[PDB]
């Protein structure tokens, strides 16, 4: 009596904690530095407390290279999930920064690339709008649910792994650009026409145009254009989230 076998409880509560905390430190909104560290640790601990008793406990000792392989596996799974989720916000940030750069908002990058003078304020605006939308669509709950679900697909125990699968996540790097253009294709196009229009004005009497009349007009036009374009991101926001989620579901397995 008075056994309280500690190794069994430790091995039951450790690896799910490692995977949950690995997702927490990288998953969007759950990985933002504004949350105190203890809150994140407690959330991981409580989620593991809820989940672990149902799972089959592992018996590999913590003092073995098998434990190191397990820890590497959990870290890989968590960071892969969090990063694949982060790709959508990366795409939204790309689209916003490009709209802002066609605004002429930061012209110093065309002359001094990476010269400590850059303000992608539109990128930040649409990034926080995307975060608000992600909060509204309860994406984080889904993330937690999928973190739990990847066990049935991929159990804690060391399992063999595949290859082109990693490429898939890396190939998801294309989406950030592709979908990014899909968010910027209308407005930039009209801005392009506006610039074309300015060109027609410069084909008249030489000089006396551009850098004096083009910048304010194009700034105001970009502002009101994409202010009107704001209602458009939400269907595209859901499209981006669905793309990331089903890509994750297909490739994680």
């Amino acid at each position: 009596v008075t056994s309280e076998q500690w190794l069994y409880w430790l091995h039951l509560y450790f690896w799910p904690l490692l995977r949950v905390l690995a997702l927490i430190s990288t998953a969007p909104i759950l990985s933002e530095r504004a949350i105190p560290k203890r809150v994140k640790l407690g959330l991981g601990i409580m989620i593991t407390l809820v989940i672990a008793p149902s799972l089959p406990a592992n018996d590999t000792p913590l003092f073995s290279i098998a434990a190191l392989w397990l820890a590497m596996q959990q870290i890989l799974i968590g960071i892969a999930l969090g990063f694949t989720m982060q790709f959508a916000f990366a795409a939204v940030r790309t689209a916003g920064e490009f709209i802002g750069l066609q605004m002429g908002l930061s012209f110093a990058t065309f002359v001094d690339p990476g010269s400590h003078l850059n303000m992608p304020v539109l990128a930040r605006i649409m990034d926080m709008l995307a975060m608000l939308l992600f909060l509204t669509f309860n994406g984080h709950l889904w993330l937690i649910s999928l973190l739990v679900d990847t066990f049935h697909t991929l159990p804690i125990g060391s399992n063999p792994v595949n290859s082109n699968a990693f490429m898939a996540l890396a190939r998801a790097g294309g989406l950030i650009f592709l979908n990014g253009l899909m968010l910027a294709l209308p407005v930039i196009t009209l801005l392009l026409t506006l610039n074309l229009a300015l060109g027609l004005l410069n084909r008249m009497a030489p000089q006396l145009s551009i850098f004096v009349i083009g910048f304010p007009l194009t700034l105001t036009v970009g502002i009101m254009l994409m202010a009107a374009l704001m209602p458009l991101i939400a269907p595209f926001c859901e499209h981006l989230f669905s793309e990331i989620f089903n890509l994750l579901a297909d490739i994680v397995s």
Binding site: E4, S25, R38, L41, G44, I45
Partner: protein, 92 residues
């Protein structure tokens, strides 16, 4: 509650269709230790009372066992607190 009994019958139906924890273990250990200590104390008070049949040998041995059990509980609490402090220091 009436609704509470409704919930009980609902869980019974759930069992029909279908056909403890670390905090619980710690609570059980605390209850066992406290029960042992209370038993030793009660026997000591009975001996001090003068009631027949209670031997000083048993009183002293039971007090010894209760002290050992208390010390075991103290050590378990100390470690458990140390482990919790270690975990809460983990970087996230």
């Amino acid at each position: 509650a009436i609704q509470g009994i409704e919930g009980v019958i609902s869980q019974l139906q759930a069992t029909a269709m279908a056909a403890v924890s670390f905090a619980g273990q710690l609570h059980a250990a605390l209850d066992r230790i406290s029960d042992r200590q209370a038993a030793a104390r009660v026997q000591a008070e009975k001996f001090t009372l003068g009631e027949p049949g209670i031997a000083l040998n048993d009183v002293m041995a039971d007090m010894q066992k209760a002290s050992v059990s208390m010390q075991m509980g103290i050590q378990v609490r100390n470690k458990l607190v140390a482990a919790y402090q270690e975990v809460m220091s983990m970087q996230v």
